């Protein structure tokens, strides 16, 4: 959880979000059955133009306080070993211990 | 259990015959909770018994269990240096359990088309005693006289 590594994933977040439209248009044109092989191929070229650091697959979500790559809960934003610490203090609304 | 507070549940759900031993035999032949499979298999076996056997099949069944139940059972006890065996009279409730278990486990080992006619075959064999279950019963019985020395 080195801060350089957090910085380089946050910058990945900006790089992914800052296009947000050329990916959609190009992939929609590619997946459109009636667009001709020319618009297939130019769209492939266009997709290969932009940096690889733009896709959502490259984006590994992390804890917002520690950045632990493992043990994530996307309903919250915290990691495995901070969600419990915050919950025992009652900070998380409507969270208790369950028996049933 | 050391406490001896564990009571027993009573099961009696004979569908049509309204008997008692039949249901316990059902449970013995039931495997992995396949109760209806046991229903149809045992009832086909009993139908074959009824068509082969002139009389009703339930008294033939109880007579067959009468010839498989062991009167005495041998049980190993170690004297502290030697491996002995001791013959003891079987608990009256335990006789039916041994009878059912032996009959089922011996009907399982025939090797013919299905175990319905296997169960019929050993039900008729045990009706007088030319089967293999009666063979094991008499072997276990004769082990008692073979070890009558200790008894006490």
């Amino acid at each position: 959880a080195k801060e350089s590594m957090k910085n380089r994933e946050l910058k990945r977040q900006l790089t992914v979000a800052k296009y947000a439209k050329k990916r959609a248009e190009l992939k929609a044109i590619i997946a459109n059955p009636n667009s001709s092989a020319e618009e297939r191929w130019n769209a492939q070229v266009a997709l290969q133009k932009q940096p690889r650091d733009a896709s959502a697959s490259r984006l590994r979500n992390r804890c917002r306080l520690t950045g632990r790559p493992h043990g994530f809960y996307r309903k919250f934003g915290l990691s495995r070993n901070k969600l419990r610490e915050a919950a025992m203090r009652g900070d998380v609304p409507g969270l208790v211990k369950a028996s049933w | 259990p050391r406490r001896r507070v564990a009571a027993k549940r009573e099961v009696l759900a004979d569908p049509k015959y309204g008997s008692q031993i039949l249901a316990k035999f059902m449970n013995h032949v039931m495997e992995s909770g396949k109760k209806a499979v046991a229903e149809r298999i045992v009832y086909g076996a009993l139908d074959k018994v009824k068509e082969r056997g002139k009389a009703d099949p339930l008294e033939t069944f109880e007579k067959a269990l009468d010839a498989i139940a062991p009167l005495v059972e041998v049980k190993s006890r170690r004297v502290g240096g030697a491996t002995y065996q001791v013959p003891v009279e079987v608990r009256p409730s335990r006789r039916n359990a041994l009878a059912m278990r032996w009959l089922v486990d011996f009907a399982r080992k025939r090797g013919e088309k299905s175990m319905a006619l296997r169960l019929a075959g050993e039900l008729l064999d045990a009706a007088e005693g030319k089967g293999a279950a009666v063979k094991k019963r008499e072997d276990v019985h004769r082990m008692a006289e073979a070890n009558k020395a200790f008894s006490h």
Partner: protein, 208 residues
């Protein structure tokens, strides 16, 4: 063995959550992040003031913060030139507008967080820990406090081996859910490492 957090096990039963609002699949994570950031920032900034409970409420697109402190004079100085800067800063952090209400708490020696902080800052000043434990326990027991336990762990003094000490007085039943056991932990940073302080305070039974 280990013991469950006494505040968490009593959540809903006798204790109350420190952040009461409602959110949905989108804004829930953002609201939790804002709450955690605001709480740590407020604690760090008003460390000098004796702040214990930061209660957060969220009405429609708004936010209300109430502060439980033993010293309200520092925050409320010469008719409001302090809380307003805080309001503006919190609105810089919290997108929604904020609202502040400074709540003063009597009997600070009956609040676990304050006792823990005082003991920790005493140990930071190279004071013997047994004297601090005795003084805190006696101060707590002069008024109310049907029971109190204080535990301190670490390299007490300057020894190069860690150990744990604790002193109790009265009754502190942790296995009874009716009892509202106030509980707190804190860390004291010394030249030889970290010292952990835990405080349990028993107020009374809740009946009916």
């Amino acid at each position: 063995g280990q013991k469950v957090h006494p505040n968490g096990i009593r959540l809903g039963i006798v204790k109350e959550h420190t952040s009461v609002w409602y959110a949905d699949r989108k804004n829930y994570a953002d609201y939790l992040f804002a709450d955690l950031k605001v709480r740590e920032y407020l604690q760090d900034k008003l460390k000098s003031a004796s702040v214990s409970r930061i209660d957060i409420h969220r009405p429609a697109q708004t936010a209300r913060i109430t502060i439980h402190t033993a010293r309200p004079g520092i925050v409320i100085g010469k008719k409001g030139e302090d809380v307003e800067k805080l309001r503006q800063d919190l609105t810089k952090q919290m997108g929604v507008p904020v609202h502040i209400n400074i709540e003063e708490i009597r009997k600070p020696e009956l609040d676990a967080m304050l006792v823990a902080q005082s003991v920790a800052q005493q140990l930071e000043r190279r004071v013997m820990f047994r004297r601090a434990m005795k003084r805190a326990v006696q101060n707590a027991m002069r008024i109310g406090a049907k029971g109190i336990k204080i535990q301190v762990s670490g390299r007490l003094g300057g020894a190069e081996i860690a150990r744990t000490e604790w002193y109790r007085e009265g009754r502190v039943p942790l296995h009874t859910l009716r009892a509202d056991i106030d509980y707190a932990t804190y860390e004291a940073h010394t030249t030889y490492g970290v010292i952990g302080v835990k405080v349990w305070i028993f107020k009374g039974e809740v009946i009916g």
